[PDB]
Structures are given as C-alpha cells and as structure tokens.
C-alpha cells in the first residue's frame, strides 16, 4: 500500500546510495551490488576503449516498434553464434543499453520495457548455462 511503499522507497534509496559510496572505495554492499557495478564499469570501459567502433555500429541501428524485436534477436543470436564469452556478454549489455537510448531518442520509449524483458529472458534461457559453467557472475567480478 502507499504507506508501506514510502517506507520501501526510503530503504531502497539508502541502500542504493550506500552501495554506490562503498563501491567508490573498492568495497561492496552485497555480492549482487558488486556484480552490478562490475558490469556498469565493464560496459563503460568497453564503450570507452571501442568508442569509435561502438559509436559506428550503434549509429547504423534502424528501429521501428514493429521490427525492434526482430532486430534485437538477429543481432544477439549472431553475437553468440559461435559461443559465449564474458566480453560478448558485456557487448550484449552495451548493445541493449544502446538500443534503449536509440528508442528514447526516436520517441519510441515504449520499447524500453520490452527490450528489458527480451534481455532478461535471453539471460535466463540462452546465457545462464554458460555463465553457471564458467563460475557464475562472481567469477566475472574477479575477472
């Protein structure tokens, strides 16, 4: 209810802020917190080192609502065609975030929630077995 929700939102804001400040000092709130910001950092580094190539490829995106899923699916299934690796997983997140940014830029904000669902499913059904075989996200954090 609305009363409980204000309590929950306050708690979430605190945890978010403390998690961030811990991370700035090489510490972490929790294992999941460490994963989230290893991923944020890895994506930033990927986009920074490969700014020229990543900018270029994202510039080529042609999105409409009726073709967005087809596009997302063809790109990710090609990305993983010959296997999975941690670098490809980072590329996958970076690509999804770029797809979202493009969608909002083009006044297709409706696609943002759709892309998030498509990615979460992809993680569950395509990528999870490899991730689990390769030491889970904690291994990505160490790596």
């Amino acid at each position: 209810g609305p009363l409980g929700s204000m309590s929950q939102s306050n708690r979430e804001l605190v945890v978010d802020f403390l998690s961030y400040k811990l991370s700035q000092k090489g510490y972490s709130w929790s294992q999941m917190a460490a994963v989230k910001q290893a991923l944020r950092e890895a994506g930033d580094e990927f986009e920074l080192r490969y700014r020229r190539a990543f900018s270029d490829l994202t510039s080529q995106l042609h999105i409409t609502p009726g073709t967005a899923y087809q596009s997302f699916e063809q790109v990710v299934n090609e990305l993983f065609r010959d296997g999975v690796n941690w670098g490809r997983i980072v590329a996958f997140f970076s690509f999804g975030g770029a797809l979202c940014v493009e969608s909002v830029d083009k006044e297709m904000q409706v696609l943002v929630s759709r892309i998030a669902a498509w990615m979460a499913t992809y993680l569950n059904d395509h990528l999870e077995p490899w991730i689990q075989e390769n030491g889970g996200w904690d291994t990505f954090v160490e790596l």
Binding site: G87, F95, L143
Partner: peptide
C-alpha cells in the same frame, strides 16, 4: 546503412578483443 549482420559482426569483434584482453583462453 549497414545491415544488422554487419552491426552484429562488429559488436562481436570488439566484444572478443575486450574478452581477449581480460580472459585466459
């Protein structure tokens, strides 16, 4: 405009370069 196949090959290419830097084969 480059087709989705080109976008994906370019994305995988740099994902692989990024991987190779950090991860042992």
């Amino acid at each position: 405009m480059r087709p989705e196949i080109w976008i994906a090959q370019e994305l995988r290419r740099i994902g692989d370069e990024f991987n190779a830097y950090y991860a042992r084969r």
